[PDB]
Amino acid sequence: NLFQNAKFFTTVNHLKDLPDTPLEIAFVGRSNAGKSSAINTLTNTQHINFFELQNGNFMVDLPGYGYAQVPEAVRAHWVNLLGDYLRHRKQLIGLVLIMDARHPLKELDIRMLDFFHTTGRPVHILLSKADKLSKNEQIKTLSQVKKLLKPYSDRQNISVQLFSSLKKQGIDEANRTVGSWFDAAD
Amino acid sequence: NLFQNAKFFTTVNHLKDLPDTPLEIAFVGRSNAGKSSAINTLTNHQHINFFELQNGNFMVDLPGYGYAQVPEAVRAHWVNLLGDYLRHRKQLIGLVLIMDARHPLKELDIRMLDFFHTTGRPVHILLSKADKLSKNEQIKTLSQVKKLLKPYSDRQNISVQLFSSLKKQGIDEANRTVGSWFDAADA
């Protein structure tokens, strides 16, 4: 239900110009198309998009860090800026990390998890495009990814789910998990 | 060698009692990072220790943070005092941050880098106890630490090396790097 109430609020061009939100969660990932599809499924030139949730809380969609998702000449700088945002954004209470289920935990995915890990805040992973895998492959990939992330449990509660925008699969768990973060924070 | 034959000068427990040194560099790190061993290796030898370098300037050894044996309130007090020193010490020209190569860049390491970042001064990282990692693990850790520190390069010259007190690995680069800071200060 939490994401169904989201309303687009404002777009900002530079992290330097972020508004002072009460509380926010961030969506990050390699692929703009996969991340946009997930957000569209959850809510029914890429820039920084703020969506208003209930009670003055916010979700922030940040430009993807994969090839071509921002111009290649500035992508290294963007990775550093986004990494610094994860490390330092004081009102960021949780991270939604979107990764293609066929190719999870690429180097930049892990770098973003490392940038965020010192916060001790929770991460929820959507293994997107789950419909591209057989059901047995989906189950195996989910367990493999969870096992690979166990070292982050020294500081963080990491949760992982399969997600499909095409099949509308996984909406309830995403709402439940992110909802619990704001309930805890409020 | 910048650090060779450095001599102990004084020990202070309060920032009010700091000597009015001409120029200094500071050593910081988490408790059990290997900072005392690294200083002994470099020099061939809670409170703040001042050492006089042969060049007449000073090296400042600040007590390790995150020491699990002492109460949370004492740890927090020293985090605040360290941040005060790093942010405000006018004659501090560079920072040597020592981190256990097996577990680098913990939250308190980030906190110290953040305290010092507003100075624009250089930071040199020693990834210590490197001998406890395989050669490939040492290189991979070098790579990951350098990637995670790139955001600080917007305002500071950040350099990183592997270091082993036990195997006397990394001494030359540590001397050359910190020495260059004193050269640039002109004296």
Ligand SMILES: Nc1nc2c(ncn2[C@@H]2O[C@H](COP(=O)(O)OP(=O)(O)O)[C@@H](O)[C@H]2O)c(=O)[nH]1
């Ligand atoms: N293998 C190895 N052990 C080290 C090295 N430097 C320090 N140690 C060990 O790490 C522990 C903590 O070292 P110490 O210098 O006292 O750390 P400090 O608390 O940061 O001053 C000690 O047991 C040392 O024996 C090193 O280069 N290699």
Ligand SMILES: [Cl-]
């Ligand atoms: Cl940490």
